[PDB]
């Protein structure tokens, strides 16, 4: 049971912007989560072949990971901050959907999400 192609990270015909909020999402939100001791399972698409999880992409239809988010931010892929915030939230929700409560991977996601929520609470107002 195979891996799908990764999420899109470049699209020239997609309208996009650089805003102070999106800069914050990269320089603060992404960075802070990326350096966390629990970040590594989330830093790239799940290789569900290597992990022997043949059902993974049969259940998780909208996968998202921080490697993809990082690329999108570095590529100025997004139109607004909420588009990027949705990607983070999809990543967390997918984790809680696929896994059992209390699993180590869920604890890792919860630690990242707690930080994510704190940084989003301090999202600067649009300039
Ligand atoms: C018996 N045995 C048990 C574990 C094993 C297993 C079970 C469930 C997942 N589910 C998952 N869900 C979401 C993600 C994420 F991408 F959102 F982060 C994700 N990533 C990811 C990446 C690398 C590793 Cl090595 C891991 N392993 S791990 O056990 O979870 C960890 C990090 C060492 C605690 C996880 N993995 C992955 C698995 F391997 C199956 C067979």
Domain residue ranges in the chain: 19-123
Atom of ligand 1 nearest to the CA of 98: 12
Structure-determination approach: X-ray
- Centre of ligand 1 to C-alpha 79, Å, is 32
Instruction: Report the chain's C-alpha Rg in angstroms.
Output: 15
* Residues within 6 Å of ligand 1 by CB: 41-42, 46, 51, 53, 65, 95, 98-99, 104-105
Give DSSP secondary structure letters for 62-112: S---HHHHHHHHHTT--SSHHHHHHHHHHHHHHHHHHSPTT-HHHHHHHHH
Structure tokens at 58: 């049969």
Instruction: Give the resolution in Å.
Output: 1.8
């Amino acid at each position: 049971s195979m891996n799908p192609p990764p999420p899109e990270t470049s699209n020239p015909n997609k309208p996009k912007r650089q805003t102070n909020q999106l800069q914050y999402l990269l320089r603060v939100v992404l960075k802070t989560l990326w350096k966390h001791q629990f970040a590594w399972p989330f830093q790239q698409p799940v290789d569900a072949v290597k992990l022997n999880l043949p059902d993974y992409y049969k259940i998780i239809k909208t996968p998202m990971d921080m490697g993809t988010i990082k690329k999108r931010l570095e590529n100025n892929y997004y139109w607004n901050a909420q588009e990027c915030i949705q990607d983070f939230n999809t990543m967390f929700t997918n984790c809680y959907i696929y896994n059992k409560p209390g699993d180590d991977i869920v604890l890792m996601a919860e630690a990242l999400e707690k930080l994510f929520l704190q940084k989003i609470n301090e999202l600067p107002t649009e300039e």
